[PDB]
């Protein structure tokens, strides 16, 4: 075939019922995730090619960066709850990996404050039970697929993107290949 199991994707031998349609995992500590977000705009280009009716979910993971790793997962929960993903993603990545000014929960908070979320509403979200279950969701999903590495993408709980089986000499071509593969898997 042109799309072969073990080549551009792998099949989970333990399929995850009821999973979100397109499911992506990242860490703000993850260097290829930084690339995937700010240089390649993977998430974005995938959605540009997904059919009608297909929902896209993106979750943060704990297994990088220890204590701040977890803080970040809670902050991403807050980001989802307030719908401000698009205003904090880039400053969180640059804060962790570029400028290295994110060293504590308070530094994470400053990013939101600077991006215009109010202290009052940030702290309320941060401490809210809606955020707690949203953290639980992020962890459950990673758990459902025994996730040990990011970036990672899953389609319908049964296929996992395999970017290492795609040429990277051209970044535009890599992205479309990646996106087209998600689209192919989406219609499987």
Q: Output the CA angle 96-175-45, nearest 5 degrees.
A: 80
What are the beta bridge partners of residue 56? 22
Q: Is the dihedral of CA 32, 38, 43, 45 positive or negative?
A: negative
Asked whether 155 and 183 are in contact (CB, 8 A), the reply is no
Task: Outline where 23-84 has alpha helix (H).
Answer: 31-34, 42-47, 66-82
Report how far apart the first and last C-alpha atoms of the chain are (Å, whole number): 14
Q: Output the CA angle 152-4-22, nearest 5 degrees.
A: 35
Asked whether 21 and 156 are in contact (CB, 8 A), the reply is yes
Nearest to 37 by CA among 77, 89, 83, 112: 89
SS3 per-residue string spanning 24-38: EEECCCCHHHHHHHH
Q: What is the DSSP letter of 94?
A: I
Which residue range forms the structural domain that includes residue 51? 1-188
Instruction: Give the chain's domain count.
Output: 1
Q: What is the DSSP letter of 95?
A: I
Asked whether 85 and 79 are in contact (CB, 8 A), the reply is yes
**The two three-digit tokens of residue 67, written as one number:** 């204590």
Q: Provide Rg for the chain, Cα atoms.
A: 17
Give resolution in angstroms: 2.2
Q: What is the DSSP letter of 20?
A: -
How far, in Å, CA of 90 to CA of 182, rounded? 24
SS3 per-residue string spanning 172-185: HHHHHHHHHHHHHH
CATH code of residue 170: 3.40.30.10
Method: X-ray
**The two three-digit tokens of residue 85, written as one number:** 């993903």
Q: What is the DSSP letter of 148?
A: -
Q: Judging by DSSP bridges, how do beta strands 22-26 and 56-60 pair with one another?
A: parallel
How far, in Å, CA of 133 to CA of 129, rounded? 6
SS3 for 146?
Answer: coil
């Amino acid at each position: 075939a042109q799309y072969e199991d073990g080549k551009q994707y792998t099949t989970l031998e333990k399929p995850v019922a009821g999973a979100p349609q397109v499911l992506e995992f990242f860490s703000f500590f993850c260097p290829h995730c930084y690339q995937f977000e700010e240089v390649l705009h993977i998430s974005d280009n995938v959605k540009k090619k997904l059919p009608e009716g297909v929902k896209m979910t993106k979750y943060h993971v704990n297994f990088m960066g220890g204590d701040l790793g977890k803080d970040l997962t809670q902050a991403w929960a807050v980001a989802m709850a307030l719908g401000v993903e698009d205003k904090v993603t880039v400053p969180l990545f640059e804060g962790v990996q570029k400028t290295q000014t994110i060293r504590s929960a308070s530094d994470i908070r400053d990013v939101f404050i600077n991006a215009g979320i109010k202290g009052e509403e940030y702290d309320a979200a941060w401490n809210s039970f809606v955020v707690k279950s949203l953290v639980a969701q992020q962890e459950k999903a990673a758990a459902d697929v025994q996730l040990r590495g990011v970036p990672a993408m899953f389609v319908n709980g049964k296929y996992q993107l395999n970017p290492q089986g795609m040429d990277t000499s051209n970044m535009d071509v890599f992205v479309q290949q990646y996106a087209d593969t998600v689209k192919y898997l989406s219609e499987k």
